[PDB]
Amino acid sequence: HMTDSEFFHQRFRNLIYVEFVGPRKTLIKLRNLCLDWLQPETRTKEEIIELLVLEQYLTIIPEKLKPWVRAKKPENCEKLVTLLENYKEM
């Protein structure tokens, strides 16, 4: 159903290793966070791969374009590519 999956993406990426918690509990947490981000029960392996490609692409955007790309929120790669095909001379 509708969720803030990006909240979980950020938590997954920003979780820190806390010695008091230790390795097994840290694995459990990471797994829960990644599943609440990617919701594999709703998506195919192919769709998941596309999300990972999008995640990486968003990080490598030239810095001068990042505010623009994010104001726009392209929700998939194709979008992002057609957008950068028309946003660049900045």
Residue numbers in the entry: 1 to 90
The authors write:
Human paternally expressed gene 3 protein (PEG3) is a large multi-functional protein of nearly 1600 amino acids with a mass of about 165 kDa. Consistent with the presence of a large number of zinc fingers, PEG3 has been shown to bind DNA in a sequence specific manner, and has been detected predominantly in the nucleus, supporting the notion it is a bone fide transcription factor. PEG3 contains a SCAN domain near the N-terminus.
The crystals diffract to a resolution of 1.95 Å and the majority of the residues are located within well-defined electron density, apart from a few residues at the C-terminus. The human PEG3-SCAN domain folds as an extended V-shaped structure, with approximate overall dimensions of 50×25×25 Å. The domain aligns with the N-terminal sub-domains interacting with partner C-terminal sub-domains to form a dimer with approximate dimensions of 50×37×30 Å. The free energy of dissociation (ΔGdiss) is estimated as 19.4 kcal mol−1, and suggests that this assembly is thermodynamically stable, consistent with the observation of a stable dimer in solution. The human PEG3-SCAN homodimer is held together by an extensive network of hydrogen-bonding, salt-bridge interactions and van der Waals forces. The majority of these intermolecular contacts are formed between α1 and α2 (the N-terminal sub-domain) of one subunit and α3 on the C-terminal sub-domain of the partner. A hydrophobic patch comprising Phe49, Trp74, Leu75, Ile85, Ile86 and Leu89, from α2 and α3, make van der Waals interactions to equivalent residues in the partner subunit.
